[PDB]
Amino acid sequence: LVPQAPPVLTSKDKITKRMIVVLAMASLETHKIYVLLNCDDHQGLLKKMGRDISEARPDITHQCLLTLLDSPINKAGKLQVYIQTSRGILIEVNPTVRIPRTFKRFSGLMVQLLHKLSIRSEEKLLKVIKNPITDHLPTKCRKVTLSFDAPVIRVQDYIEKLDDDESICVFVGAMARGKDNFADEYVDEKVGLSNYPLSASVACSKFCHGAEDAWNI
Questions:
Q1: Nearest 5°: phi and psi at 151?
Q2: Is 131 annotated as a binding residue?
Q3: Phi–psi pair at 165, nearest 5 degrees
């Protein structure tokens, strides 16, 4: 007894109250040898490039996207996802896009996106857009960064404290390790979800679950 075709939310809608997740510091870099650089397949190459092999982690972004887009909140049309790469590329993800389950085809899709600047259905399902993210977010929107070092909140508590017209944008480090400062230019609060450090995919899942509770999804 719920709407079977909810409105597809984009950055063009500045009003509708929604949850936004920004996958920040995403490790999405192309190389012709085209593939996404990753720590499992390109250890030798990354070493010769003088890179920290452990930083090449596109799999984290892949798993976060699957968790987020599979969620009840996404199907209910109350979720948006953006990607901010470690190299400053900003990507808007259409809620209806199908993300491949295998890493190989995910990499193939990301390579095409980063080279062509969009992925077409003629509507765009993935699009490279202009920084800063704040130019695209809903007019009334809370902005928070998830951090292990921050005080722990219950997601439902936090979501229920939003005004009826106020969206929430959550910045999540799409990384295994790193400092929580990636979105200090945009946010005015940092919060924790657990007394344990969480994988990015798990943090995404917990936040989706808590919003689903609060919004009766």
A1: -60, 140
A2: no
A3: -115, 10
Evaluate whether 139 touches 14 at the Cβ level (below 8 Å): yes
Residue 3 annotated as lining a ligand binding site:
no
40 belongs to an annotated ligand binding site: no
Structural domain contains residue 134:
yes
In a domain, 154, yes or no: yes
Closest alpha carbon to 69 in 204, 160, 215? 204
Joined tokens for residue 176? 């295994």
**Number of domains the chain contains:** 1
Chain centre distance of CA 31: 23
Range of the domain at 44: 20-217
Q: Tell me the CATH number at 114.
A: 3.40.1280.10
Helix (H, G, I), strand (E, B) or coil at 68: helix
Amino acid at 36: L
Residue 79 is assigned to a ligand binding site: no
| Distance of alpha carbon 57 from alpha carbon 37, whole angstroms | 8
In a domain, 1, yes or no: no
Q: Is 178 annotated as a binding residue?
A: yes
Note whether residue 148 is domain-resident.
yes
Q: Which helix (H) or strand (E) element contains residue 120? A: strand 118-120
